[PDB]
C-alpha cells in the first residue's frame, strides 16, 4: 500500500473514529451514520461491525480497517483487469469467445497454434460444454495459481 | 443516496 493509499484511509477511518481513540463502536458508528442520516439498527451495526473484527475484540482499529480496505480496492482492480483481459479475446464483444476469435486473437497477438490446439484452449476453459468461454470461465482461467 | 453519500455509506456497508 502506498502512503497515498494509506492517507486516504487514514482520512475514513477518522470519519467513522469519532473520538479519536484508534477504534470505531458500535453506538459511534450509529452517531455517525444518524450525524449523516441513515438511521439504522442495532442489527445493522453490529453486522457492520462483525464483518470487520478480524480479532473479536468487539471494535474495528485501524489495522483491520485498513485489511478490509485494501481487499476491496485490489478486489475491485482486479475484476476490472480481468473484464478488460476478456475484451482482448472477445473480438466482438458479445460476452462469449468462440474458437473463431480465438484463432484471429492469436493470429493478431502474434502467437502460434494449430486449430486442434486453438481447441484445446477453448475446451480446457469451456466448463458447461457449449464450445464457447463466457466471463466466469474465463475468470477461472485468469485466476489459476 | 446519491453518489457521494452511496461512497461514504459503502466504506463500511461495502
Ligand atoms: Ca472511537
Ligand atoms: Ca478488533
Ligand atoms: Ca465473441
Ligand atoms: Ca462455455
Not at chain 1, 5 to 34: C, P
Request: glycine letters at 8%; charged letters at 35%.
Amino acid at each position: 500500500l502506498t502512503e497515498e493509499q494509506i492517507a486516504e484511509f487514514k482520512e475514513a477511518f477518522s470519519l467513522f473514529d469519532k473520538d479519536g481513540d484508534g477504534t470505531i463502536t458500535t453506538k459511534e458508528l450509529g452517531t455517525v451514520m444518524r450525524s449523516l442520516g441513515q438511521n439504522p439498527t442495532e442489527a445493522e451495526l453490529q453486522d457492520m461491525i462483525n464483518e470487520v473484527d478480524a480479532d473479536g475484540n468487539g471494535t474495528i482499529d485501524f489495522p483491520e480497517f485498513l485489511t478490509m480496505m485494501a481487499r476491496k480496492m485490489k478486489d475491485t482492480d482486479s475484476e476490472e483487469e480481468i473484464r478488460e483481459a476478456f475484451r482482448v479475446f472477445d473480438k466482438d464483444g458479445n460476452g462469449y469467445i468462440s474458437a473463431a476469435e480465438l484463432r484471429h486473437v492469436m493470429t493478431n497477438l502474434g502467437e502460434k497454434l494449430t486449430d486442434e490446439e486453438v481447441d484445446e484452449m477453448i475446451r480446457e476453459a469451456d466448463i458447461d460444454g457449449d464450445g464457447q468461454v463466457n466471463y466466469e470461465e474465463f475468470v477461472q482461467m485468469m485466476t489459476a495459481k | 443516496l446519491n453518489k457521494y453519500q452511496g461512497f461514504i455509506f459503502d466504506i463500511v456497508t461495502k
